[model samples]
Target: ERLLDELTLEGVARYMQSERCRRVICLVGAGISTSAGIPDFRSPSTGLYDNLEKYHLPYPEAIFEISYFKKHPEPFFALAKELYPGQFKPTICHYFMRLLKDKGLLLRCYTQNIDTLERIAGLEQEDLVEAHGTFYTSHCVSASCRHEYPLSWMKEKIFSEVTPKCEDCQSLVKPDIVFFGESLPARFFSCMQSDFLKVDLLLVMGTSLQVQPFASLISKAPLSTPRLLINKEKAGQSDPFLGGGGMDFDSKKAYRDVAWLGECDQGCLALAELLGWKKELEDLVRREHASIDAQ
Candidate 1:
């Protein structure tokens, strides 16, 4: 199979360490959370989507839409116990980002996950642009109300039987989470466009690239920057830019340039071997996941 080599975990590790890899940026999807016990979007037979469908929602997206929640909040509240922050933590793959940060080669990490695991991995908020609003913020979904609440309080409330109330106006509180009809935060859009030019490498993890906008972000990368996809299943097509010299542009850019890594956890483990940081990297990964395990 032509993909045999591309899927070979060891080869991906070598590529990251080779002379053509540096200045890396990461893009993460739901697959990254499989290790953390959080379900991804696809794999309906076993993923979150299937589990959610049992509730007989008017529509599947209703579980996360703001409009629907105003009328009925039980579905979301029913699932909140599982989504609690301490319930799940970053996976080994997440700690790998910390390793990249230590190397000072990480450009940015663009993630679709709302779990806020990336923040727990110790990425500076400036370096992390959670394209989707995170569980870390809370606000009133009603346009007339502009109240905000500390996500910490809401978190506690969600775990209990009580629906969260707005601290400012005593109105029903909604997590600043993006609902289907709502627009994504303006800050995310601005950062994506401006930061597009600064990326040296794009590392895509845990996602299947099925979602829009998030999938589209990969295209904005400089053609010269290499993309590394690390997920259970490959989801996008990346055409490496080739130079006149007959090598990919990214390959030519690095004393160590751009590289791809697949299977976020395995790839990071392999990377630790290549970078000779195995002990430290492994320790970080285990420590981060001590409290969380994939079901």
Candidate 2:
């Protein structure tokens, strides 16, 4: 109640730096990884959908449909080669998540992305949740014999223009990403329920909040909880802020706890600077760049 006076970046920073706000939860989307050269699913022209003509998908999003993948695995694998790990480095936004962990302030980071960039940024397995699953492992699509394989196996076959099959059953192998018709992992629903109830602050980044289930996670936080949006546009039911206006503070509506910082990478950099972490973030970006190049 004492911290609701200023619904601004500085206010959020102050709370973050305060003793009462240690458990932080972050909900991230594809926008955070776009700067790393990963194309989001829905953007126009430069998006993955627009450039998927080479795959001749029936529809732009069919590549991710479970039924479509079952019928046509070639297109999916072709795209997978590009989206695979070791290709793009994690952006500064990812480093910010890592910084939170390093400071022991992160409770959990629930991400809608399947790129596994959070792992690349050094977020431990316990602290991170890939809500839509990840490409880190693949499994046989057979209903009876669902054997799993390492990401290395998928990469080797995908890159070689060979569709991977299960060694035991010879069934098609697919990464564990949740396709349109597939059920989301049980971990997403279970962890989010507890995270929502426990978090002192919620930071949402690089998401349009258009997707279901994942989009609704923000609303699960207690109304008094402080929520911050860092993205390219105002999304969901979040109130618009243009640098000057009443905070319109409300403790009963979750969106009322919200503030906005547009642009994922720049917004994260600004927040890092606000918290006097500019040098540390810059160093991490450089280190990540060097490590990525070495790979």
Candidate with maximal TM-score:
2
List TM-scores for all candidates, in order.
Answer: 0.78, 0.87
**lDDT of each residue in 1-295, candidate 1, tens digit only:** 1111242345446556766556677888777887777766466755565578667898787888877888888788778766554565787888888888988878788888888788878888887878777877778655688687776788778877788876666677877667777888787788888887787667777776668778888777765555566666545644356211111213323221223445678876776776688899878777666645543
Candidate 2 residues lying further than 4 Å off, grouped into runs, are 47-60, 82-86, 238-258
lDDT of 1 at 51: 76
Tens digits of lDDT, candidate 2, 1-295: 4554477788888878887787889999989998888778667755566568777777888989999999898888887777664476899999999999889889999999888889889998789778889987789999999999987788889889998999999989999899989998888888987887888888889998878788878778776677788888777664456221222334453333555656799998988999999999999889888988997
Identify the runs in model 1 with alpha carbons over 4 angstroms from their true place.
Answer: 1-22, 47-57, 82-86, 142-147, 238-262, 287-295
Model 1 TM-score, 2 decimals? 0.78
Judged by lDDT, which candidate is best?
A: 2
Ten-residue stretch with the least lDDT total in model 2: 242-251
Residue 105 miss distance in model 1 (angstroms): 1.7
